[PDB]
Amino acid sequence: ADLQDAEAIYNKACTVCHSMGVAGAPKSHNTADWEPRLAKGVDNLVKSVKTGLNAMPPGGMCTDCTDEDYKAAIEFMSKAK
Numbered sequence: 001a002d003l004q005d006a007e008a009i010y011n012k013a014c015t016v017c018h019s020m021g022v023a024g025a026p027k028s029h030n031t032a033d034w035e036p037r038l039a040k041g042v043d044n045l046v047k048s049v050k051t052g053l054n055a056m057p058p059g060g061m062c063t064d065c066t067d068e069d070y071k072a073a074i075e076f077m078s079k080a081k
């Protein structure tokens, strides 16, 4: 796919699960779901993404993804997760 826009990255990748909340995924736009993430910081969740959590593919479903577009994508939502 395409690594030009944080919006395009989340909207194509963090979309299957997080858009509706399928597989128990936490929402794109919550406050209480992001609170216990923003309490640590930002670049702590980018890691659990690149690593692939249990129900989550390694890379968060992106292959060639750089921390730049990665974090921009996390911060497009609510700068935690």
Ligand code: HEC
Pocket: 009, 010, 013, 014, 015, 016, 017, 018, 022, 023, 024, 025, 026, 037, 045, 046, 048, 049, 053, 055, 056, 057, 059, 060, 061, 062, 073, 074, 080, 081
């Ligand atoms: C379904 C195939 C998913 C895709 C695609 C992405 N995510 Fe995801 N995410 C999913 C689930 C079911 C969960 C687990 C919720 C639980 O607590 O059981 C998550 C969780 C996260 C988290 C939070 C991890 C934590 O600290 O608990 C983050 C940081 C997150 N997801 C980010 C993220 C991004 C940025 C993705 C696109 C690149 C992405 N996820 C894709 C399911 C799915």
